[PDB]
Structure formats: C-alpha cells, structure tokens
Amino acid sequence: QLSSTFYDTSCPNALSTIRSAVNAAVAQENRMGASLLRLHFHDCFVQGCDASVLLNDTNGGEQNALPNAGSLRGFGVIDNIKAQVEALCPQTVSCADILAVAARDSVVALGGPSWTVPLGRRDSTNSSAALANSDLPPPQFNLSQLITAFGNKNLDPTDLVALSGAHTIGQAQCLNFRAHITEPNINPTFAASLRANCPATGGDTNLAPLDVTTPNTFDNAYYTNLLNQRGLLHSDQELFNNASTDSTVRNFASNAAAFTTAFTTAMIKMGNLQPLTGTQGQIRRNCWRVN
Numbered sequence: 001q002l003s004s005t006f007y008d009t010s011c012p013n014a015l016s017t018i019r020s021a022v023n024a025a026v027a028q029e030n031r032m033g034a035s036l037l038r039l040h041f042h043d044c045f046v047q048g049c050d051a052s053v054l055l056n057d058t059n060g061g062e063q064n065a066l067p068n069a070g071s072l073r074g075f076g077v078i079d080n081i082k083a084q085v086e087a088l089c090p091q092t093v094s095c096a097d098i099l100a101v102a103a104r105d106s107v108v109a110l111g112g113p114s115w116t117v118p119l120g121r122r123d124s125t126n127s128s129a130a131l132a133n134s135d136l137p138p139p140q141f142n143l144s145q146l147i148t149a150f151g152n153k154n155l156d157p158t159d160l161v162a163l164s165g166a167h168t169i170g171q172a173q174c175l176n177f178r179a180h181i182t183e184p185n186i187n188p189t190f191a192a193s194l195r196a197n198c199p200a201t202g203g204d205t206n207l208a209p210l211d212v213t214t215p216n217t218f219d220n221a222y223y224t225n226l227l228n229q230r231g232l233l234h235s236d237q238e239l240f241n242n243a244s245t246d247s248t249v250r251n252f253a254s255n256a257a258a259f260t261t262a263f264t265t266a267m268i269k270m271g272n273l274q275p276l277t278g279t280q281g282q283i284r285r286n287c288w289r290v291n
C-alpha cells in the first residue's frame with residue numbers, strides 16, 4: 001500500500017520541506033544525521049514503522065526501554081520538522097513517514113546513497129516497551145543472535161551486514177562498548193585508545209565514534225575497521241570473526257558500491273516493516289502524543 005508519490009497532491013511541498021530541515025540539522029551537527037537514521041531503525045523494528053517510538057504521553061513508553069533510554073536522540077528535530085509540515089498541510093503527513101524520509105535525507109547529507117522512500121505509513125496509537133526490549137539487538141549479542149533478531153524481521157544475513165554499516169556514522173557511549181575493550185578480538189592499540197576515555201566503571205556516557213576512520217562520512221570504512229579489529233561494539237566485530245559473514249565484510253570493504261546498494265536494499269525492506277495504512281492508525285498532529 002506504500003507509494004513514493006503518496007503526497008504528490010495532498011502535500012506537494014512536504015518532502016522538500018523535510019529535506020531542507022534535515023540538511024540544516026545535519027549541517028548544524030553531523031551526528032544528528034546518524035541519530036535520525038537510528039531513530040527510524042528503532043521505530044521500524046518495534047511493531048513496525050508506525051512512529052511508536054516517538055510517543056511520550058501515557059501511550060508511550062518505548063523511550064524508557066533499555067535499548068532506548070538515555071541513548072536515542074533527535075526527537076526535537078523530528079518535532080520541529082513535523083510542525084513545519086503541519087503548517088503547510090495540516091494533519092496530512094504522518095510522523096512515521098517523516099522518520100523514514102529524514103533517515104534517507106540524513107544518509108545522503110552525510111555522503112551516502114539515496115533511495116526511493118515509499119510513503120503512506122500512518123501513526124500508531126500505542127507503543128511497546130516490551131517489544132523494544134525483545135526485538136532490538138543489544139551490543140553483547142553474538143552473530144547467531146544477531147542473525148536470529150534480523151531474521152525475525154525477515155532480514156537475511158546480508159541485510160544484517162549491510163545495515164550494520166550504518167555504524168559508519170555516529171557515536172556510542174562507553175557503557176555500550178566497554179565490554180569489547182577487554183575482549184580477545186580487538187586490536188590492542190585501538191583498545192588502549194578506547195580505554196583512555198572509557199573506564200571499566202564510571203564514565204558511562206563518554207562518547208566514541210562507531211567508525212574511528214570517518215565518523216561523519218557515510219562510507220564503507222566501517223568494514224575496513226572490522227578487517228583490522230577496530231570495530232567498536234562487540235556486535236560489530238562479530239561480523240568479521242572467522243564467521244559466515246566474513247566474506248561479505250571483505251566484499252563491502254573492497255567494493256563500496258556493493259555496500260551502498262546492499263544498504264539501500266536493506267533500508268527499503270526495513271522501512272516496509274508492518275506499516276499502518278489506509279485508515280489504520282492516525283496522522284498525529286504532534287508526534288509525541290496520540291490525537
């Protein structure tokens with residue numbers, strides 16, 4: 001039911017308004033492009049791409065689940081974009097669609113590939129912290145659990161390897177990578193540099209780039225890090241670890257276009273997860289609350 005032309009008559013200037021605002025937000029802080037991409041992932045993996053992650057009224061709660069709390073960001077950017085679009089075409093463009101478009105626009109703004117975003121998603125009237133906890137993968141997962149978690153969303157291992165490349169941009173907090181500092185499959189010089197700003201206890205919120213090579217550029221350097229044992233998260237390095245995914249990591253390191261085309265293929269699949277369409281759900285007037 002999703003269509004790339006969904007708003008071509010009902011809100012002609014929605015997409016260009018979103019583009020201008022996302023480009024400005026990324027220019028203000030490049031990390032924000034990564035944050036918006038991740039926000040769309042955390043939407044789509046939890047009862048579909050339905051903007052459930054944005055609710056923070058009594059119908060919300062996903063923001064307090066372990067994978068999200070103190071970690072997700074960009075809510076204010078999305079709210080600011082939504083208000084701009086509401087001023088142009090009241091109660092027409094869903095928050096769910098804004099998240100998907102903002103993710104694509106963010107990737108492009110940071111040098112990554114474009115793709116066609118199908119539209120027509122509608123906004124949920126509920127949320128699921130329980131499903132956030134069960135369906136979002138934590139960084140201590142091993143490859144087998146990552147494959148299962150993605151397979152439960154009908155994403156295959158290549159989609160896993162390609163979507164993990166989103167970590168070519170953005171940052172992580174010490175509390176989420178400190179375990180990997182001490183593990184056997186990290187380069188020792190790299191591990192020492194991480195330890196300098198990430199203690200074993202305390203400093204939980206100290207940041208490090210997911211991609212030490214180009215933290216603000218959407219490129220295949222994520223994969224060359226893995227080949228050199230400079231993945232940041234445990235779950236990153238699981239992809240190149242005498243494992244079934246090694247040959248795909250090597251391919252994406254040697255063939256940037258193979259990576260970007262696999263990435264758009266997987267992003268389109270992800271953005272097609274369990275949409276509310278037609279008359280299901282609503283068009284929120286404000287993304288943080290149910291009408």
Ligand code: HEM
Binds near residue numbers: 035070138163176235
């Ligand atoms: C494959 C399993 C994955 C795991 C275990 C994982 C885990 C994480 C963790 C722990 C962080 C750091 C959060 C923090 O410390 O606050 C992070 C950041 C990030 N993740 Fe993932 N992630 C995964 C897949 C994905 C996917 C599929 C996408 C998008 C397509 C994605 C996009 C991002 C981005 C862009 C950031 C940086 C966000 C920012 O700087 O604000 N990740 N991820």
Ligand SMILES: [Ca+2]
Binds near residue numbers: 042053
């Ligand atoms: Ca959702």
Ligand SMILES: [Ca+2]
Binds near residue numbers: 167213214217220221
């Ligand atoms: Ca990069």
